[PDB]
Amino acid sequence: EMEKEFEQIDKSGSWAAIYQDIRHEASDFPCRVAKLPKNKNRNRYRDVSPFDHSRIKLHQEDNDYINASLIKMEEAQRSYILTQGPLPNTCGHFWEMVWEQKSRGVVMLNRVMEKGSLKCAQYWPQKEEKEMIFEDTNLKLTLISEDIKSYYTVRQLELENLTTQETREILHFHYTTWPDFGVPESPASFLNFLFKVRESGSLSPEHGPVVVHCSAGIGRSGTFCLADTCLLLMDKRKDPSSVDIKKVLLEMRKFRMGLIQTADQLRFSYLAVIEGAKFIMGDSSVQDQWKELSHED
Numbered sequence: 001e002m003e004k005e006f007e008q009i010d011k012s013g014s015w016a017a018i019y020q021d022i023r024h025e026a027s028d029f030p031c032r033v034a035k036l037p038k039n040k041n042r043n044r045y046r047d048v049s050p051f052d053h054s055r056i057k058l059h060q061e062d063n064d065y066i067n068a069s070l071i072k073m074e075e076a077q078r079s080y081i082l083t084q085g086p087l088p089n090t091c092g093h094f095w096e097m098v099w100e101q102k103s104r105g106v107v108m109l110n111r112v113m114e115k116g117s118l119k120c121a122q123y124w125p126q127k128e129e130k131e132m133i134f135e136d137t138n139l140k141l142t143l144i145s146e147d148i149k150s151y152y153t154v155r156q157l158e159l160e161n162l163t164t165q166e167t168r169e170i171l172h173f174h175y176t177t178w179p180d181f182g183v184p185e186s187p188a189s190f191l192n193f194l195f196k197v198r199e200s201g202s203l204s205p206e207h208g209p210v211v212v213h214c215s216a217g218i219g220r221s222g223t224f225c226l227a228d229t230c231l232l233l234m235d236k237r238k239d240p241s242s243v244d245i246k247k248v249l250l251e252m253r254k255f256r257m258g259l260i261q262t263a264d265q266l267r268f269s270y271l272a273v274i275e276g277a278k279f280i281m282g283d284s285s286v287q288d289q290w291k292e293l294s295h296e297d
C-alpha cells in the first residue's frame, strides 16, 4: 500500500537510500550510436544518452540520431518520448521527430535559461509574424496563439511539412516554474498542469506518443512520466493501492537512463500520485481545488 509505504519511508528518513537503491538496480543497456564521435554535436550532455534499443530514429538516411527515447509502458498502455532540450543544430531534428512520430503534444518543463545557464535552444516561435523554417528538415513552424497562466503557458502551434504540404496542430505545454533538480511548488500545481495535458487530447492513443523534455530529458521529465503512468495504473487496477511506484520507475528506467534525478523528485512523485488518486477514487471536486490551489492567475 502506497500511502503506507510512503509514510514508512518518510518516517524512517529513507528517501535517499531508497533512491540510491533504484539507481543501483536500474538497467544497464548500451548507448553505442549516441557515443559515435560524429554525434557529439547532437548531444547536450556527455553523460546523458538514449539506449540503443529504445532510441528514436530520425527518418533521414543521412544520420538518424536524436538524443531521444521511446518510453513504452505496456501495462499502462501509454507511450512517451523523452528528449533533451534541443540544441541550435537539432531544432530541425526535434521537429522532424515530432512529425515522424505523429506527436500531437510537446511538454516542456524547463526554461530556456535557468540560473543564468543555457538549458535549451528557443526552438519554437515567440511571435506569430515571426515563423520558423527548418531548412535541413523541410519544416515550417508558426505560433498560432498562446494562453499564459502564472506558472505555465499553453501554445497552439502549426507545423507544416514543406515537402508534402500537410499541416498539423501541435499543442505545447510549458511549465515555467519547475526548478532544475527540484520539484513543482506543490502536488496541486503539478496535477492541475498534468490534467490540462490529459484533457487536451494530446495523450490520446489515436496520436503518436507525447514528447516530454526538460534540459537533459531525465529528471523533471522522468517525474512527470512516473506520476502520469502511476495514475493510469491506479485507474486500471481497481486495487489501486497495489501500484508500486519504485517498480514503475524501474520499468521506465529500462527505456531511458536516469529517470528521476533526486530523492526529492522521487518523494514528490509519491505525493503527486497519492493526491491524484483522490480524483481516480471518485472525488468530483478535487480538480477544482487543484486549480484554485495552483493559483493559475
Ligand SMILES: CCCCCNC(=O)[C@H](Cc1ccc(OCC(=O)O)c(C(=O)O)c1)NC(=O)[C@H](Cc1ccccc1)NC(=O)CCC(=O)O
Pocket (backbone or CB within 6 Å): 044, 045, 046, 047, 048, 119, 179, 180, 181, 182, 214, 215, 216, 217, 218, 219, 220, 221, 258, 261
Ligand atoms: C545521469 C548522470 C548525470 C548527473 C551529472 N550530470 C549532470 O548534471 C549533467 C546532466 C544532467 C542531468 C539532469 C539534469 O536535470 C535535472 C532535472 O531536470 O531535475 C540536467 C540539467 O538540467 O542541468 C543535467 N551532465 C553534466 O553536467 C556533464 C558532466 C560531464 C562533464 C564532462 C565529461 C562527462 C560528464 N557535463 C557536460 O556534459 C558538459 C557538456 C560537454 O562537455 O559536452
